[PDB]
Structure 1
Amino acid sequence: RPTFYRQELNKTIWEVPERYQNLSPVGGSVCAAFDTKTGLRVAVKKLSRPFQSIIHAKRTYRELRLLKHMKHENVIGLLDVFTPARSLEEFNDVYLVTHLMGADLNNIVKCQKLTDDHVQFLIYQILRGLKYIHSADIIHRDLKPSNLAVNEDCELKILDGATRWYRAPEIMLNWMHYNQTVDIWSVGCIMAELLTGRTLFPGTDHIDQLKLILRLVGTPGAELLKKISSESARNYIQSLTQMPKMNFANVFIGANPLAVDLLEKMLVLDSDKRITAAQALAHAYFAQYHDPDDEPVADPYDQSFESRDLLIDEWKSLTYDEVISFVPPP
């Protein structure tokens, strides 16, 4: 068992094993640090008050369960996890160690002239990562460029860290049923912004958002109005100047016509028609990169915990178990 050392960092105290040197803040909260066991440079997040409340403690436990299960290269992975505590009773603090990645898709897209080749490779890696996540019955629900870690090899990982811009219409008419293809909506929103340099749908709020979305894809016709339960929603949507679906080739006129088509298949209002990750990875656009023998799915994820109402000490303790049974990767 490791031997620790304490430290005063940006108000916050920090106690991590000595395998970790030259901790310096990056913005719970995060330090860039040096992994002496591996030479490699890592991210260390101290969760902020992991067990302050039921919602906190269940979050913390969901956090540890998600990171622990994620083993794919376009998705954040967990190198190490630790607490300074020796007992369940002591147990108050949780630290997460992960690959240092530094920059996000924002830090790229706003200061590098992007080819169509970058676009292809960046979307392809989102989608392959989305495939793996979707296969475990996890929906991300918040895909946006700050949730995509990109390195200098332009190599990409998904994680969780203006939301509404990338959100499906149906998650703004708080529907709660969502298929996985809320994520393919965000992906479409992201790809377009790469091709283009501009936010596809910069709603000024959740009312604007829909105006803006409807302007491009058009108001829903009969087949779609059928599936809308709420008297509210239908009353709102049916209450607009009925709108034409715009011609994507016009909207994204200079773009690669294969990327355009893919957007069409991605930004479909009725989420039964949205292409999936597995299907997009096959679209012509990614023929440079596609490889059906290198597009793994995830082991089954047990997430029945999600519907337990538990006390702080049960979540806590479950979290402790989880820290304990941690085996590093290979």
Structure 2
Amino acid sequence: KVTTVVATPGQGPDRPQEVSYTDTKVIGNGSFGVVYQAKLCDSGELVAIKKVLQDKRFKNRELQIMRKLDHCNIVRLRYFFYSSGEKKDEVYLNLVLDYVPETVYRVARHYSRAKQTLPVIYVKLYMYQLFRSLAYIHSFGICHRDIKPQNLLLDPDTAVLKLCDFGSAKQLVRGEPNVSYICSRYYRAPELIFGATDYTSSIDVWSAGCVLAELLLGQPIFPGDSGVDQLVEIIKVLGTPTREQIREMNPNYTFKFPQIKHPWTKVFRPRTPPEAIALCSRLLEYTPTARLTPLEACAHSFFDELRDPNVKLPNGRDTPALFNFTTQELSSNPPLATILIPPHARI
């Protein structure tokens, strides 16, 4: 069964073209809608198709965001098209994206089930690429607002990571309030748990620190099915937030909390590299402004191994693209290019 549509390319002028695809199968489900895998008849390339119900009252925000993004660590919008679907008188928006075969969720789960941890070389590769994608979207004021292992796609052979799911993504403008009910259980910044509506893009940095700690630990660092439980777990590690730290995140919670004074070194297994622990404590900070920015995290000494000219993947292959930064990508701190682009790098 070959399906032919007239799809509009994701980038460039709005000039639709006939796109034919086959071998369609569901690869993802959720409250958002459905993600399919399909094969393009023309090149044989595999693609993913996110199908969502299109609102008649407004333009789709995820599509407007996707059309402006062009980064090697973000899943690319190749085409988009409208169609019918499961509901009779409803219109669906279909986003044709690059296909990526794995997720950090599945890969980390394979390691947990085998009582092994993901090798630190992969922790550095995956986390570095996640921080590059965040530096990129944050350069446009865009916050993803749902960073979690399931949204981090991976090609296991090339070790390329691609951020996906821009369904919660929004441009955060200072002074505009934003819903606090975004972000998934385990990865929510403490200001979100306290119900702040004045949060910044640093909520993505807290989420990324939770993914890093989880990859190091083999399980989530701040588990819990309620905000109280999550905050107890946060406080056990970070200690009790001071009145200033509360004011900096929370919206008027000045506080019957348990009093805890805990060393970050004792949180992880003894074989954990000290630079990984130092990176965690800098991402996972109560005060949103104290957290490292994504570009500062990229320049962290934990990723120095990635900058070594002789670094190779365990499978023998070369590392993926890591130093092809743009002016846009570096704009939050241009002097960091001196660390970020190593002498051997030609990108």
Aligned mate of 1:158, from 145, 154, 163: 163
Q: Secondary structure at the match of 1:25?
A: strand
Q: Does 2:192 correspond to 1:171?
A: yes
CA RMSD of aligned residues (A): 2.6
Q: Does 2:39 correspond to 1:34?
A: yes
User: What residue is the counterpart of 1:146 in the other structure?
Assistant: 150
The two structures have a TM-score, normalised by structure 1, of 0.75
Q: Which deviates further from its counterpart, 97-106 or 285-294?
A: 285-294
Contact kept, 8 Å, 2:138 with 2:201, in 1: the verdict is yes
Q: Identical aligned pairs, as a percentage?
A: 31
Contact kept, 8 Å, 2:23 with 2:38, in 1: the verdict is yes
Deviation at 1:178, TM superposition (A): 1.0
User: What residue is the counterpart of 1:127 in the other structure?
Assistant: 131
User: What residue is the counterpart of 2:298 in the other structure?
Assistant: 281
The size of the alignment, in residue pairs, is: 272
In 2 relative to 1, CA 228–94 (structure 1 residues): closer, same or farther, beyond 3 Å? closer
Contact kept, 8 Å, 2:51 with 2:93, in 1: the verdict is yes
In 2 relative to 1, CA 51–276 (structure 1 residues): closer, same or farther, beyond 3 Å? same
User: What residue is the counterpart of 1:74 in the other structure?
Assistant: 73
Q: Does 2:325 correspond to 1:272?
A: no
Q: Secondary structure at the match of 1:19?
A: strand
Deviation at 1:148, TM superposition (A): 0.8
In 2 relative to 1, CA 297–82 (structure 1 residues): closer, same or farther, beyond 3 Å? farther
User: What residue is the counterpart of 2:325 in the other structure?
Assistant: 295
Q: Does 2:51 correspond to 1:46?
A: yes
Q: Secondary structure at the match of 1:83?
A: strand
User: What residue is the counterpart of 2:236 in the other structure?
Assistant: 215
In 2 relative to 1, CA 225–109 (structure 1 residues): closer, same or farther, beyond 3 Å? closer
Deviation at 1:94, TM superposition (A): 2.1
Contact kept, 8 Å, 2:83 with 2:94, in 1: the verdict is no
Q: Does 2:279 correspond to 1:262?
A: yes
Q: Secondary structure at the match of 1:72?
A: coil
Contact kept, 8 Å, 1:35 with 1:41, in 2: the verdict is yes
Structure 2 unpaired stretches of 5+: 6-16, 168-182, 308-320, 330-347
In 2 relative to 1, CA 241–170 (structure 1 residues): closer, same or farther, beyond 3 Å? same
User: What residue is the counterpart of 1:326 in the other structure?
Assistant: none
Give the distance between the partners of 1:229 and 1:93, measured in 2 at CA: 38
Q: Secondary structure at the match of 1:141?
A: coil
Give the distance between the partners of 2:154 and 2:67, measured in 1 at CA: 21
Deviation at 1:226, TM superposition (A): 4.7
Aligned mate of 2:265, from 240, 246, 249: 249
Contact kept, 8 Å, 2:37 with 2:47, in 1: the verdict is yes
Deviation at 1:39, TM superposition (A): 2.3
In 2 relative to 1, CA 19–208 (structure 1 residues): closer, same or farther, beyond 3 Å? same
The one-letter amino acid paired with 2:207 is S
User: Which has the larger strand fraction?
Assistant: 2
Structure 1 unpaired stretches of 5+: 6-15, 300-330
In 2 relative to 1, CA 251–149 (structure 1 residues): closer, same or farther, beyond 3 Å? same
